């Protein structure tokens, strides 16, 4: 019958690894690099679009950076279509929590929920896992500014600075070298762009190949503002930091 054609997506290898998870991670290593850096006064998200065209409408385009709510955003590395499925689920979870408790969802609770969904696809159902790794940048009044990552296994961890996608080994070494704890957002903006500029597989880093976002308490008094940078604003910050 049908058993003949079943790939068995949820089995261990003899070494105790999950085949499909490992192969999904291999897929993600070819995706555009995304970086997140956490500072005392905010968080930076920087990400590289994959080999673009001059005829791509950039100002209406979004493939890397997504808003989950007013306090939490994500950077994507992997299959964009897979990511949008999970992103919509995460947006709904955040609203469910807000309706139930009348408070914004704490960052970790949202991250744990999405990570548990990813885990399920590795243990039951016989379906392929989601080929997506997320960087979560968010703020709540318990832990303040937070950075997390999750991958197809459903495992998640917290970070001061982190990269996903292509050339993460090189990127993580560069971040580990120049990152300091008392760093500020404007310094973190520069570090993120400098790291992408050195690790990129492209010839030069330009505005049309980037997506950029900041989460700041640089919002008038005790509140948080998300800023998804426009194409012209990415062009300006590239000149300011002296990359173009």
């Amino acid at each position: 019958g049908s058993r003949r054609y079943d790939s068995r997506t949820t089995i261990f290898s003899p070494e105790g690894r999950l085949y499909q998870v490992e192969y999904a991670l291999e897929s993600i290593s070819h995706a555009g690099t995304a970086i997140g850096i956490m500072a005392s006064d905010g968080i930076v998200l920087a990400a590289e679009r994959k080999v673009t065209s001059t005829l791509l409408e950039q100002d209406t385009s979004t493939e890397k950076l997504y808003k989950l709510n007013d306090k939490i955003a994500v950077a994507v590395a992997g299959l964009t279509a897979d990511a949008e499925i999970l992103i919509n689920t995460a947006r709904i979870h955040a609203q469910n929590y807000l309706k139930t408790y009348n408070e914004d969802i704490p960052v970790e609770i949202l991250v744990r929920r999405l990570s548990d969904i990813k885990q399920g696809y590795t243990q039951h159902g016989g379906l392929r896992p989601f080929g997506v790794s997320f960087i979560y940048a968010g703020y709540d009044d318990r832990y303040g500014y937070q950075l997390y990552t999750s991958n197809p296994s459903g495992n998640y961890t917290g970070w001061k600075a982190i990269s996903v996608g292509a050339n993460t080994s090189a990127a993580q070494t560069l971040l580990q070298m120049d990152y300091k704890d008392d760093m500020k957002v404007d310094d973190a903006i520069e570090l993120a762009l400098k790291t992408l500029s050195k690790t990129t597989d492209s010839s030069a880093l330009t505005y049309d190949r980037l997506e950029f976002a900041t989460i700041r308490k640089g919002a008038n008094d005790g509140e948080v503002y998300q800023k998804i940078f426009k194409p012209q604003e990415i062009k300006d910050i590239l000149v300011k930091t002296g990359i173009t």
Binding site: I28, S29, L55, L56, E57, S61, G125, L127, R128, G131
Partner: protein, 250 residues
């Protein structure tokens, strides 16, 4: 009986490739060329009506389809897969939007819904991916004119101009040289006809070419008068005669 294929037929290979999606893209590559160009006051989508037999009436086969009054779609790849996607896209525009908000969806969100359907055929049990790439052109009040490409994986990207299928690589180079941000709709149609001629072997006329625009509101195609705010569809399919008129000024 019962569908006993509850497992994924698309899986990651050791190299990280999703084989069935790659193979679906190969089917698209074999498909007939279709293109889209965005102008300041409109969008044009076009393709060749590759008739399987001269006894076949190719007017009864619509490659360019109205999804909403302001949104149209064209494809490259497997025709039958496209036809069912058009049926699903038309319905989802109503069930997940018009029956909720009392208005038609904006281009980007309808594209998002079609993309979701194509993504699910890439992960759900006992199915293969759709063997088509779509080009969706449309207009809405707050976003203006737009053009999107949707692939078998479910990924979608906005374009100023693009081409898919057989001679897409050559066609995209041709479009890069001609496109600017000051094009009027008639200029975009002219460029569309020039671009499409390169990938067509045989007859090149209004009967072998299918072309539609997203442009001005057509009150003559509304079917009723009396409501000032209703001004008619922006989607219009060009006639055989209208195409031939622009082939003399070619």
């Amino acid at each position: 009986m019962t569908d006993r294929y509850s497992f994924s037929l698309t899986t990651f290979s050791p190299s990280g490739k999703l084989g069935q999606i790659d193979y679906a893209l190969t089917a698209v590559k074999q498909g007939v060329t279709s293109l889209g160009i965005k102008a300041t006051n409109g969008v044009v989508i076009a393709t060749e009506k590759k008739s399987s037999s001269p006894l076949a009436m190719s007017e009864t086969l619509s490659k360019v389809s109205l999804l909403t009054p302001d949104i149209g779609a064209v494809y490259s790849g497997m025709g039958p897969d496209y036809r069912v996607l058009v049926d699903k896209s038309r319905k989802v525009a109503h069930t997940s939007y018009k029956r909720i908000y009392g208005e038609y969806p904006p281009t980007k969100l309808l594209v998002s819904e079609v993309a979701k359907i194509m993504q699910e055929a890439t992960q759900s049990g006992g199915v293969r991916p759709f063997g088509v790439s779509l080009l969706i052109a449309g207009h809405d009040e707050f976003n203006g004119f737009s053009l999107y490409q949707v692939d078998p994986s479910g990924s979608y990207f906005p374009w100023k101009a693009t081409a898919i299928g057989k001679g897409s690589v050559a066609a995209k180079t041709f479009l890069e040289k001609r496109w600017n941000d000051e094009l009027e709709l008639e200029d975009a149609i002219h460029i569309a006809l020039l671009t499409l001629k390169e990938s067509v072997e045989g007859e090149f006329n209004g009967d072998t070419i299918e072309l539609a625009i997203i442009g001005d509101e057509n009150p003559d195609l509304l079917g009723y008068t009396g409501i000032p705010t209703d001004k008619g569809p922006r989607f219009r399919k060009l006639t055989s005669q209208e195409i031939n008129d622009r082939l003399e000024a070619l």
